[PDB]
Scaffold this active site. Structure first.
Site, PDB file in Angstrom:
ATOM      1  N   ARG A  29       0.808  -1.228   0.000  1.00 29.13           N
ATOM      2  CA  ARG A  29       0.000   0.000   0.000  1.00 29.13           C
ATOM      3  C   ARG A  29       0.840   1.276   0.000  1.00 29.13           C
ATOM      4  NH1 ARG A  29      -1.533   2.136   6.009  1.00 29.13           N
ATOM      5  NH2 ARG A  29      -0.662   0.391   7.241  1.00 29.13           N
ATOM      6  N   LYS A  54      11.945  -7.405  -0.642  1.00 27.10           N
ATOM      7  CA  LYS A  54      10.510  -7.643  -0.824  1.00 27.10           C
ATOM      8  C   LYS A  54       9.850  -6.624  -1.752  1.00 27.10           C
ATOM      9  CE  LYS A  54       6.293  -9.165   1.470  1.00 27.10           C
ATOM     10  NZ  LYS A  54       5.245  -8.802   2.467  1.00 27.10           N
ATOM     11  N   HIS A  91      18.019  -3.931  17.285  1.00 28.31           N
ATOM     12  CA  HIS A  91      17.713  -4.792  18.419  1.00 28.31           C
ATOM     13  C   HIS A  91      16.981  -4.031  19.510  1.00 28.31           C
ATOM     14  CE1 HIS A  91      19.577  -8.478  17.122  1.00 28.31           C
ATOM     15  NE2 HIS A  91      20.672  -7.823  16.781  1.00 28.31           N
ATOM     16  N   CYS A 140      12.390  -6.696  18.350  1.00 20.93           N
ATOM     17  CA  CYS A 140      11.639  -7.548  19.265  1.00 20.93           C
ATOM     18  C   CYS A 140      11.067  -6.808  20.483  1.00 20.93           C
ATOM     19  CB  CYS A 140      12.490  -8.740  19.717  1.00 20.93           C
ATOM     20  SG  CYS A 140      14.144  -8.274  20.194  1.00 20.93           S
TER      21      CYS A 140
HETATM   22  O1  LIG Z   1       0.912  -7.858   2.295  1.00 20.77           O
HETATM   23  P1  LIG Z   1       1.661  -8.981   2.940  1.00 20.77           P
HETATM   24  O2  LIG Z   1       2.545  -9.786   2.020  1.00 20.77           O
HETATM   25  O3  LIG Z   1       0.815  -9.799   3.874  1.00 20.77           O
HETATM   26  O4  LIG Z   1       2.775  -8.246   3.856  1.00 20.77           O
HETATM   27  C1  LIG Z   1       2.447  -7.563   5.051  1.00 20.77           C
HETATM   28  C2  LIG Z   1       2.444  -6.066   4.785  1.00 20.77           C
HETATM   29  O5  LIG Z   1       3.719  -5.660   4.311  1.00 20.77           O
HETATM   30  P2  LIG Z   1       3.950  -5.129   2.805  1.00 20.77           P
HETATM   31  O6  LIG Z   1       3.605  -3.663   2.801  1.00 20.77           O
HETATM   32  O7  LIG Z   1       5.389  -5.475   2.577  1.00 20.77           O
HETATM   33  O8  LIG Z   1       2.980  -5.948   1.994  1.00 20.77           O
HETATM   34  C3  LIG Z   1       2.151  -5.318   6.076  1.00 20.77           C
HETATM   35  O9  LIG Z   1       2.125  -3.925   5.799  1.00 20.77           O
HETATM   36  P3  LIG Z   1       0.876  -3.023   6.251  1.00 20.77           P
HETATM   37  O10 LIG Z   1       0.308  -2.485   4.964  1.00 20.77           O
HETATM   38  O11 LIG Z   1       0.003  -3.998   7.017  1.00 20.77           O
HETATM   39  O12 LIG Z   1       1.504  -1.924   7.083  1.00 20.77           O
HETATM   40  C4  LIG Z   1       3.165  -5.672   7.179  1.00 20.77           C
HETATM   41  O13 LIG Z   1       2.827  -4.940   8.356  1.00 20.77           O
HETATM   42  P4  LIG Z   1       3.773  -3.796   8.990  1.00 20.77           P
HETATM   43  O14 LIG Z   1       3.709  -2.650   8.016  1.00 20.77           O
HETATM   44  O15 LIG Z   1       3.157  -3.497  10.342  1.00 20.77           O
HETATM   45  O16 LIG Z   1       5.129  -4.472   9.150  1.00 20.77           O
HETATM   46  C5  LIG Z   1       3.120  -7.185   7.412  1.00 20.77           C
HETATM   47  O17 LIG Z   1       4.016  -7.616   8.435  1.00 20.77           O
HETATM   48  P5  LIG Z   1       3.548  -8.541   9.663  1.00 20.77           P
HETATM   49  O18 LIG Z   1       4.020  -9.945   9.407  1.00 20.77           O
HETATM   50  O19 LIG Z   1       4.222  -7.853  10.832  1.00 20.77           O
HETATM   51  O20 LIG Z   1       2.048  -8.412   9.672  1.00 20.77           O
HETATM   52  C6  LIG Z   1       3.480  -7.910   6.117  1.00 20.77           C
HETATM   53  O21 LIG Z   1       3.530  -9.328   6.297  1.00 20.77           O
HETATM   54  P6  LIG Z   1       4.883 -10.183   6.061  1.00 20.77           P
HETATM   55  O22 LIG Z   1       5.594 -10.266   7.386  1.00 20.77           O
HETATM   56  O23 LIG Z   1       4.362 -11.528   5.597  1.00 20.77           O
HETATM   57  O24 LIG Z   1       5.683  -9.418   5.039  1.00 20.77           O
HETATM   58 NA    NA Z   2       1.650  -6.694   0.828  1.00 24.76          NA
END
Ligand SMILES: O=P(O)(O)O[C@H]1[C@H](OP(=O)(O)O)[C@@H](OP(=O)(O)O)[C@H](OP(=O)(O)O)[C@@H](OP(=O)(O)O)[C@H]1OP(=O)(O)O
Ligand code: NA
Length: 205
Positions: A29, A54, A91, A140
Site C-alpha cells: 500500500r 521484498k 535490536h 523484538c
Molecule cells: O501484504 P503482505 O505480504 O501480507 O505483507 C504484510 C504487509 O507488508 P507489505 O507492505 O510489505 O505488503 C504489512 O504492511 P501493512 O500495509 O500492514 O503496514 C506488514 O505490516 P507492517 O507494516 O506493520 O510491518 C506485514 O508484516 P507482519 O508480518 O508484521 O504483519 C506484512 O507481512 P509479512 O511479514 O508476511 O511481510
Molecule cells: Na503486501
C-alpha cells in the site's frame, strides 16, 4: 543495562549491504518506504536487506548513526513519492515489565528526536517533500504483552511531540525477518510463526 553489544556510532564504519530482489513480494500500500537501519549488527543489516528485497523497486535503505549522520546503502531517495512507510530495524534491549525500553540504544523519546532531525536533514539533502504515514518497528518486544504500554506508546507520542503524526506498528514478541523479507514472531510454545496478530499492535490516533 548490560544487553546485547551495540554498534550505533559512526555510520562510515558500518558494513554495506547487498539487496537481492525477491519475486514473490506482491503489492504494498506504500508507494515508497525507507528501511532505516539503526545499528551495525550483522543480523540487523541482513533483516534490513531482506525487507528491501521484498519491495526492491520502491525501497531505500538508509543507515543512521548516533550522531545523526546517515548514508544510503540501497536504492534511490529521488524515486520516493506518495504514501510512505518507515521500517525501523535494530535490536530491542533493556527489558522491563512493559517489555524492551530501547531500540538500538535509544529510548522512545531519543529515537523520536533522531528521526525528526533525520527527516529534516534527509528531505533537504535529497530534494524531497515527503514524510512517513507509517512506522513499522522491526525490533523484538517493543510494546507490552497486553499492548497497553511500553516503547511503542512512548514512541508514537514522542514522534507527535517532535512534529510527526504517524501510525506505528510494533511487536510484543521476539521478531525475525526471513530471506523473502517476511516477519516471523514467536507463539506460546516458542515456535516461529507468521502473521500472529496477538504478537503485534497497530497504534493510530
Ligand atoms: O501484504 P503482505 O505480504 O501480507 O505483507 C504484510 C504487509 O507488508 P507489505 O507492505 O510489505 O505488503 C504489512 O504492511 P501493512 O500495509 O500492514 O503496514 C506488514 O505490516 P507492517 O507494516 O506493520 O510491518 C506485514 O508484516 P507482519 O508480518 O508484521 O504483519 C506484512 O507481512 P509479512 O511479514 O508476511 O511481510
Ligand atoms: Na503486501
Amino acid at each position: 543495562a548490560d544487553g546485547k553489544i551495540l554498534h550505533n556510532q559512526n555510520v562510515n564504519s558500518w558494513g554495506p549491504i547487498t539487496v537481492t530482489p525477491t519475486t514473490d513480494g506482491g503489492e504494498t500500500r506504500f508507494d515508497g518506504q525507507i528501511i532505516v537501519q539503526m545499528e551495525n549488527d550483522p543480523v540487523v543489516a541482513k533483516a534490513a536487506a531482506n525487507l528491501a528485497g521484498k519491495h526492491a523497486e520502491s525501497s531505500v535503505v538508509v543507515q543512521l548513526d548516533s550522531d545523526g549522520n546517515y548514508r544510503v546503502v540501497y536504492g534511490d531517495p529521488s524515486k520516493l513519492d506518495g504514501k510512505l512507510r518507515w521500517q525501523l530495524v535494530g535490536h530491542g534491549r533493556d527489558h522491563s515489565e512493559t517489555n524492551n525500553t530501547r531500540l538500538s540504544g535509544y529510548s522512545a523519546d531519543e529515537l523520536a528526536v533522531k528521526l525528526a532531525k533525520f527527516q529534516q536533514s534527509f528531505n533537504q539533502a535529497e530534494n524531497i517533500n515527503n514524510k512517513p504515514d507509517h512506522i513499522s518497528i522491526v525490533g523484538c518486544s517493543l510494546v507490552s504483552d497486553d499492548k497497553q504500554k511500553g516503547f511503542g506508546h512512548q514512541f508514537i507520542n514522542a514522534m507527535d511531540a517532535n512534529g510527526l503524526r504517524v501510525d506505528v506498528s510494533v511487536r510484543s514478541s521476539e521478531l525475525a525477518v526471513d530471506e523473502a523479507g517476511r516477519k516471523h514472531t514467536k507463539d506460546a510454545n516458542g515456535d516461529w510463526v507468521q502473521k500472529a496478530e496477538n504478537n503485534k499492535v497497530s497504534l493510530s490516533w
